[PDB]
Amino acid sequence: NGPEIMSKLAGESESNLRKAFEEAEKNAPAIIFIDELDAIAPKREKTHGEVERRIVSQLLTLMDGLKQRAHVIVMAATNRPNSIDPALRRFGRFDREVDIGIPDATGRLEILQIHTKNMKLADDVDLEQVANETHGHVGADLAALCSEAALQAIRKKMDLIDLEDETIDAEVMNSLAVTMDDFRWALSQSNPSALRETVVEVPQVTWEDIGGLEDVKRELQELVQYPVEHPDKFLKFGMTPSKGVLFYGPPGCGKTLLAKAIANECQANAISIKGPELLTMWFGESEANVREIFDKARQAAPCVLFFDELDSIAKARGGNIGDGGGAADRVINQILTEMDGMSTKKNVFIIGATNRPDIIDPAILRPGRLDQLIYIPLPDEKSRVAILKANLRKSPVAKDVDLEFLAKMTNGFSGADLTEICQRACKLAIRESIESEIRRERERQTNPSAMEVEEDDPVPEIRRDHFEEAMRFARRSVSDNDIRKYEMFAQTL
Amino acid sequence: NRPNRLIVDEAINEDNSVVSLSQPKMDELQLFRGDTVLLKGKKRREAVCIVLSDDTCSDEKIRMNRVVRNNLRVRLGDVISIQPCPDVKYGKRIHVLPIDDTVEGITGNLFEVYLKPYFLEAYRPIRKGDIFLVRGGMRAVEFKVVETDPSPYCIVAPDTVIHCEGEPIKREDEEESLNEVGYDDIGGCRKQLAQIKEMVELPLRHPALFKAIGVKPPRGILLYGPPGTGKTLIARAVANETGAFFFLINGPEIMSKLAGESESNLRKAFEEAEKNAPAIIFIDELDAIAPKREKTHGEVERRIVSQLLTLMDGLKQRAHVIVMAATNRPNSIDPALRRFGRFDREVDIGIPDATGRLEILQIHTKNMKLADDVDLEQVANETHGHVGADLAALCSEAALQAIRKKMDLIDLEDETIDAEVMNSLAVTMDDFRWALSQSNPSALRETVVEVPQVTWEDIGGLEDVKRELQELVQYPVEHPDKFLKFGMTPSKGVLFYGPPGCGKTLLAKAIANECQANAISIKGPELLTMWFGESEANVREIFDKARQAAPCVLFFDELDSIAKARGGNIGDGGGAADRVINQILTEMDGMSTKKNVFIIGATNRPDIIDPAILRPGRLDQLIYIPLPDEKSRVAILKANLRKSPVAKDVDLEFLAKMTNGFSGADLTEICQRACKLAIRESIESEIRRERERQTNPSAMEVEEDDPVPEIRRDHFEEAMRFARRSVSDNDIRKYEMFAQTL
């Protein structure tokens, strides 16, 4: 333990370290584990005391001497690779490195299973929902949640039941069960999520979620699936697969969904970086972090890297006319620098997205960088019906509706608009249900009828009335001038 | 289950020896409010009390105060036995006697003040050995009845001769003096107090349980807040109210020594706490011991933190010792302590509100004699920014003024000042006003969180907006299952756009008042300060507060201020994006819906707002606030004028009709101007009347009549001359065009 070594004098600490190494040697096959390594050996810039520098050299000498003697293995735990000295990350001391990352929904569900073995649970546990809503937590957080959820129920029940009846015994102790309401309380009242950094995981979106764009599906598969599956075919001929693609098109056309659909289809990690992050880098003048991103993509291969709002920086410093200057800026320069110095064999695809390709710096469209450009057009009637069906496959609906009629009645729309229409219809339905239920509850309370239940779902499903009402506020979002501009850019190429 | 026993719990009444039962229990115990009842208690002792009836208390919970609990030795959560005693028999001069080695300012005849008023009009039941307490002369003295002529207990009657002895018999060692603090000595921190009570009630009153189950209790708690908020007070109160051994550590005491002595003292403290388990350790001035390594340079400073970390790690293995630490802000200390197993649990004390300040004043004004002009509500309203220490200092200074003025003149030569003249002095509100105006180093200028007092009836009109806001805010919290049945996830975030002075700021507080949720407001000057200082990190802290004050409402006004600073609508060479809005979007995107933290923005120039903040997942519902109309203007006038005296000759409807395209601010200004004219006229008339008759030596001439208690149409019509429109019709056209072009 780091603090135990740092809570002593030079002689005692540097004797304990050597004694520990000797005892590890004596009892082979032995594994030494070190934690809080940064507490012992940070970068020399942060070290001032002479004893602090004297304690690192001893560790370096011990690591160097380890290779000659015994089968002792050494493992160390740190928060980040760059928090410690760089002399340890050499050939012979700490060559091998590993990342633990974060658990996913399956991992969180597994952790809950591990922590709920000996506890008694009811039939409303549905741990899948808890795993879904448990975002940002880690193993310790899940353990704390389970303990607190158990504590609520036990404290409320026992104090009333047994504080005077009799000395609580095992039977009454284990008679108590647990309920999902306790879990909800412990997860809402106590939600100290200890994670706000990036995330890497395989998404869940599928091709069925997408509406249309089948040719784009084929063109993306040819780019991504073929190189990984069949390298010998490329070897026989002379072409090397190009990594990097750029989507350009009107907003709200499903650009963000394809980047995750491809990863789900190929079962590969995915990383998404939004425009506000880029603007934060620009304002803070913190370009080094870009490197870290690629490092992660290097250690999560195969993986897909996604960039959206790529024209945000150009928009910030003036519009199409722009401020006095050129297309180049700092962050795109660093991105190009990182892209050029990357090996093809690592299998890290790069995807960019935009709706104003004209003001993009042309240097990123050159060969060796993003060079394949794909246009995402507005959905058509055949596609629009697919979007409506895809979004409405998760809510109860009636049969009087005419989805095709709504599809034909819409022209020059986006998926976002139809999603908003569905959300508004659902809002109307829930408001009507709330009003009806509250009125029913209030009317009969005055009448002292101890038994009066005409229980019927007032509106379990929606009808054409709400949908046609929502059609009043529904209107176009993208101007036809924008579509003309997009077509002009797609033709002038 | 042998319904003879019953739990004990807190009482609201100030008087002694009164137990309040739960009403549904009348005929099961068979005793009414006119019957005294015997309650059993540990080490074979008892008491007898009269009973009251109330509704709010729970069935199994008697309510009884500290004085009647201590002699029973009963500690809250413990169970005692209740049995009726209609066989009560009066006594003849029970012998009563002061306790303790000595009493401050004690001499002469204390019985005519500390006994007879208390027993009078009371018929208080009393058992031999009881410690019933009396209060007066701004001191709390408790008198133990040593002998009762009949036995076991007696009613006190006005026909009992009284026995004036006044001997200091020292208190027995075993009982814990009533001097100690309790839950009744703290006010304004009820929520966090309940949190701590429920968190640490089981491990101390039920450790055998925790060894009967496999679960991990907390073994470290942090409390952060400004100084003088009652942290060590809370820790000591919790320790006293559970019987757990209490240990105290002071940071400067450790830092005022050498390495060997300091790092010994820490370990000996930990071992001593271990020995006396179940025990609680309290640490204050933690930042003085373990700040972030950036601010630490001495090697011993870094060595003293590793010892604490090792001790914290080893604590989990041994005994039931709990550890609590106090700090000013969470970020001032090392991040290595805020891990799983050392200081996982964190709490904020915040600041008291008007109710909290009033409660603190009540706590600090118990033994002081006060007049009939106190109206502490006004003082609490005007006491903005003060904390418990400030209120204590204010009360002490207010008492000091009067005592120093009066006593020096009265008694410096008459005689050695005695108790009678000491306590004869009262206190007067003018002294409070002086002590509150002259000495006002309020120790608070930071943000504030509290439930506002504004209500719907304050707002004039906008009923549809009220309904549409209720649908957004009330429904998700009240009825989630209905959202679960369907597929819609409530959208959190709304934007008000409209002309200035239309009541935008009032709705954000009216909603919070209706829902009884906290509220936070950040004004444009703060945003501009962050912009100029390039301090964006502060934004994060704000959201953290909202996370720890949930459910809560967040408000932002003058959101277009930055866009206005760097040029106007045309603007300087650049785009709509800036730094602070980028950080706000970053914080909004990374926040969970279940936390129930709504966000409200307000503006009058929505055109120059960055479109990126209007996208789905962010502020997406836009509401227009139009100018008040005649029906709304009459309501605004009535709402504003419901606080000032007015005559009846006015025609409010006529004024409302005569105004077109006005704002609430304009009407409030009209009312203020009319009030100013009225007060000026009253002052002039009063001064002229006072000066005219002073020359005429008429000793008795008082035609006392309020010259103008209420205002008439004359002043209002005079104010009509300066009253004029504020918002141009062109701005109205612009707003309507923006509302139609959507």
Ligand SMILES: Nc1ncnc2c1ncn2[C@@H]1O[C@H](COP(=O)(O)OP(=O)(O)O)[C@@H](O)[C@H]1O
């Ligand atoms: N091809 C599509 N199939 C299904 N849904 C779509 C499609 N295109 C857009 N959407 C809808 O748009 C929303 C997401 O928009 P997004 O793709 O992020 O916009 P952008 O393409 O500008 O990033 C989703 O709720 C989705 O329902």
Ligand SMILES: Nc1ncnc2c1ncn2[C@@H]1O[C@H](COP(=O)(O)OP(=O)(O)O)[C@@H](O)[C@H]1O
């Ligand atoms: N919530 C409170 N209620 C009543 N008195 C308080 C409260 N908070 C502080 N005080 C007053 O402050 C004094 C103790 O201050 P203390 O809490 O020890 O300062 P710190 O907050 O630095 O620990 C007491 O005399 C007490 O009257």
Ligand SMILES: Nc1ncnc2c1ncn2[C@@H]1O[C@H](COP(=O)(O)OP(=O)(O)O)[C@@H](O)[C@H]1O
């Ligand atoms: N609907 C309303 N009902 C009552 N008073 C109002 C209303 N609208 C504005 N006011 C008056 O306006 C004043 C506050 O203006 P405010 O709402 O802060 O302006 P803004 O909306 O530009 O922030 C208050 O004194 C209040 O009397």
